[PDB]
Design a protein around this nucleic acid. Structure first.
Ligand SMILES: [Zn+2]
Lengths: 98, 539, 50, 128
DNA sequence: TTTTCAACATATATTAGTAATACTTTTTCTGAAGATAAAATGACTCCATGG
DNA sequence: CCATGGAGTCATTTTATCTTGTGTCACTTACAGAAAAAGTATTACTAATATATGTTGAAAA
């Protein structure tokens, strides 16, 4: 929203051609950054709410749907269950089979 | 959100969209939605339609199909593969529904032939003629005049009669006539590689160029066969004068409606840059020569054949000199000074032709007063676009958009030099423009690989994309405007049929003039936008 | 939710679920990965399914 | 010049002279007053303005310095871009007759929108 | 020599009025392996002229 | 008329690349500076008060 309404109030009156396409670019890098991993920091540097600490885990998107157990594999086909129980074991041979 | 948004009805339907509302707004019902499928999905076969539209097989398809064909709303072909049997393939006719799309300025074409009889029912007569002709599609003066009352004056009835000829109105539509041009270039591109009497195995070039040459020269008379042939014109029956061949079915040839509607635009361009008097001289000067100029007919096979890094030029320059030469003898050396108001000594008033100099006309055989033509239109059309973004984007937009025209791929620093204003303005009247396309962008990287703030920008034209930003004008309100016409029909939808079959009430009288003046506005718009749209689609 | 502490509930992994497939137990599997875990109603529009 | 305004201040003046250079002076009263076929044989008048501008600029009546032939050329380039006037044969220049702009159809001027109530209008946006 | 006094004085705070200057702020404002491809490799052939 | 030279297209490698990698608990802990604006601290005045502070010094032991 921010880097958009920038260009929205921009391009109406102020800014400039050279100080435009780097914004609109940066828009492109967020919206793609948004739905997938790809680009991390090819010396592009971040926007609002950074601090400049070099934080690698920047996404909670394509990954949440993708690998490991985010969701697709673990949380959907692999659903955690209900009405269950877990415990250690001990033999009871005086008990029948089954 | 509120539905007054009007997005669904708006953005996602280009190209095709116009058609399936036109026919819907015109024919409608099942008769429409078939074409909507036909344009979108390309060439299509009779049976294959039903797998999609769910139109009650071989019922609507057949009935609505011929329902289109007499109105020539489809392009029609049939053939067989090597296995056998037969099959039929279709298209959306030419510009086609286009014929419907004007139909008003085709009413205005009276004004040309309107001369020699003015302020008459004869006007109303020939108007009734044409408005019946397009509506009924193909006609025959034998069946039409037969349905027309007897015991009246035949050669007086017919109006056209000896006029049917002119440039416009009608021609026989013959067989492969509306078989698609592109494909008949293939069928005619047979017979040549098809028949090679084992000439030489070497040099497919001798096979190739000769083929295309054979393909070109054999194609020539193909469109000229309908163009004019005396089978219509010459006939002179007994107890009568020269007649057409009413035995033949004819249909309006839009090419001379192309030419006619266009020459008006050539006027309104000239009616600017010269004086109104000599302007008028240019106004009638076309009326004599508006006949043979190919105009919107000249692109023709410019569709359908691969262009060339050379042969495309040998096709261009051919169209450059051609009719400026042979029809150049049909063109204007000494005009009759046809009618004119100027008066008294009229001759040097005619010598004013040279007053037309830039940017058009003003060429001849050396010193006979005359105009170039087949080359004229090419050096004319390119400069017909004029102001297409005036009183829309603001005048400031012109000056630099015009400036971007002179030089090319120019950077805003020196735009700020040649053109001038505080950059605060440029970054509006330019940046605000680029959203509407035109200028596009060139950019080159400097002291980087490619980056954000590590390069410089340049601005170019690509007038194709420019001249193509106004084909949205098609989808623009020719989209919406025609809805306006339709989606309001529901206000009186119950009142409309009441008012038609009644010939009362206060509220009936109330919104009659409302919805009507409303209409007359919506079609006023349609005429205006149409007049603008007359340019970009061809020429 | 995961583990003890939080609460309970346990895990049928992509690896394990195959087991009940091999038996060919339908109503059990659907009784496990559906009713027992998240049973949820959705209202879908036949036209333009969403 | 300088980089800021009072550019068109002199532009509107030079345009008025260049107009007189084309055909005779304004002559707008009734239907056709202009040029009466440009004196005799509009072709026989072959005329620029160009260099003469500097001699006309001598009139001053404004706070400035003089100005070079070069920059004048750009001053004229702007009115080529605005299409107030026309560039022909190097330094030769005409006017586009769009002095009439001063005062179906094509002419954004002498036209006005409705722009109330009825929703059927032709914008240049809402397709975009 | 030292200590207590004293004592002298001078800030310290209020409320003003100026008036003027100087001085900080603030607020704009911009300059791990195995598919996929890309290109260099090379053979094929159309097509050039000439003895 | 035909062998030649030159190029144009078209298989064919070999380089540059990206997606994966057994399962479950149970805790765990946007650059910086520039300019404009706002406002203020002295900068004198009495004028009462009553500590602090310094010094010093004078006065006393
Ligand atoms: Zn729905």
């Amino acid at each position: 929203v921010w880097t958009s309404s920038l260009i929205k109030a921009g391009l109406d009156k102020g800014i400039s051609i050279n100080n435009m396409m780097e914004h609109w670019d940066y828009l492109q890098l967020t919206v793609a950054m948004y739905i997938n991993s790809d680009s991390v920091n090819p010396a592009m540097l971040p926007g609002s709410s950074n601090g400049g600490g070099k934080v690698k885990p920047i996404r909670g998107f394509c990954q949440r749907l993708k690998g490991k157990q985010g969701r697709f594999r673990g949380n959907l086909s692999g659903k955690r269950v209900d009405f269950s129980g877990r415990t250690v074991i001990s033999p009871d041979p005086n008990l029948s089979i089954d | 959100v509120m539905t007054i948004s009007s997005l669904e009805q708006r953005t996602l339907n280009p190209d095709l969209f116009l058609y399936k509302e036109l026919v819907k707004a015109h024919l409608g019902e099942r008769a429409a939605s078939v074409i909507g499928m036909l344009v979108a999905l390309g060439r299509l076969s009779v049976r294959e339609l039903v797998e999609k539209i769910d139109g009650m097989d071989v019922d609507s398809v057949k009935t609505t199909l011929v329902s289109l064909t007499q109105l020539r709303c489809v392009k029609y072909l049939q053939e067989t593969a090597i296995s056998g049997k037969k099959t039929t393939y279709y298209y959306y006719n030419e510009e086609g529904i286009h014929i419907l799309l004007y139909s008003g300025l085709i009413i205005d074409e009276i004004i040309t032939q309107m001369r020699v009889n003015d302020e008459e029912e004869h006007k109303q007569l020939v108007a009734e003629i044409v408005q019946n002709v397009i509506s009924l599609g193909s006609l025959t003066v034998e069946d039409y005049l037969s349905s027309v009352t007897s015991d009246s004056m035949k050669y007086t009835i017919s109006s056209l009669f000896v006029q049917l000829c002119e440039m416009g109105y009608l021609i026989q539509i013959s067989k492969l006539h509306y078989t698609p041009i592109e494909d008949l270039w293939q069928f005619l591109y047979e017979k040549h590689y098809k028949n090679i009497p084992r000439n030489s195995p070497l040099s497919d070039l001798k096979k190739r160029s000769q083929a295309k040459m054979n393909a070109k020269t054999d194609f020539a008379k193909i469109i000229n066969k309908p163009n004019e042939l005396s089978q219509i014109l010459t006939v002179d029956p007994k107890t009568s004068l020269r007649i057409v061949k009413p035995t033949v079915s004819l249909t309006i040839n839009l090419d001379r409606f192309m030419k006619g509607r266009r020459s008006k635009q050539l006027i309104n361009l000239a009616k600017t840059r010269v004086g109104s008097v000599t302007a008028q001289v240019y106004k009638i000067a076309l009326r004599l020569t508006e006949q043979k100029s190919p105009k919107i007919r000249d692109p023709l096979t410019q569709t359908g054949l691969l262009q060339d890094l050379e042969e495309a030029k040998s096709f261009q320059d051919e169209a450059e000199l051609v009719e400026e030469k042979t029809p150049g003898l049909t063109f204007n050396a000494i005009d009759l000074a046809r009618h004119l108001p100027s008066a008294s000594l009229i001759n040097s008033h005619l010598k004013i032709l040279a007053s037309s100099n830039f940017p058009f006309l003003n060429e001849t055989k050396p010193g006979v007063y005359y105009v170039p033509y087949s080359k004229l239109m090419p050096v004319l059309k390119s400069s017909v676009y004029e102001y297409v973004i005036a009183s829309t984007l603001g005048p400031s937009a012109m000056r630099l958009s015009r400036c971007i025209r002179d030089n090319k791929l120019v950077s805003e620093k020196i735009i700020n030099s040649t053109a001038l204003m505080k950059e605060k303005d440029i970054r509006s009247t330019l940046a605000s423009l680029i959203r509407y396309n035109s200028v596009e962008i060139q950019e080159v990287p400097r002291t980087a690989d490619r980056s954000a703030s590590r390069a410089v920008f340049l601005f170019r034209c690509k007038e194709t994309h420019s001249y193509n930003f106004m084909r949205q004008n098609l989808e623009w309100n020719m989209a919406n405007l025609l809805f306006k016409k339709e989606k309001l029909k529901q206000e009186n939808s119950t009142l409309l049929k009441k008012a038609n079959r009644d010939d009362l009430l206060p509220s009936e009288l109330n919104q009659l003039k409302m919805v009507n003046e409303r209409e007359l506005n919506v079609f006023a718009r349609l005429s205006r936008l149409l007049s603008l749209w007359e340019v970009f689609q061809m020429a | 939710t995961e583990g003890r502490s939080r609460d309970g509930g346990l895990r049928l992994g992509e690896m394990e679920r195959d087991c009940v497939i091999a038996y060919g137990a339908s109503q059990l599997l659907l009784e496990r990965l559906m009713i027992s875990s998240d049973a949820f109603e959705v209202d879908v529009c036949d036209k333009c399914g969403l | 010049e300088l980089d800021i305004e009072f550019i068109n201040s002199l532009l509107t003046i030079v345009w008025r002279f260049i107009s007189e250079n084309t055909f005779p002076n304004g002559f707008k009263n009734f239907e056709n007053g202009p040029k009466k076929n440009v004196f005799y044989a509009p072709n026989v008048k072959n005329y620029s303005t160009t260099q003469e501008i500097l001699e006309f600029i001598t009139a001053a009546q404004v706070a400035n310095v003089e100005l070079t032939p070069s920059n004048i050329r750009s001053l004229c380039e702007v009115l080529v871009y605005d299409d107030k006037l026309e560039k022909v044969t190097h330094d030769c220049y005409r006017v586009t007759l769009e002095s009439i702009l001063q005062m179906s159809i094509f002419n954004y001027f002498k036209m006005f929108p409705a722009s109330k109530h009825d929703k059927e209008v032709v914008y240049f946006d809402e397709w975009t």
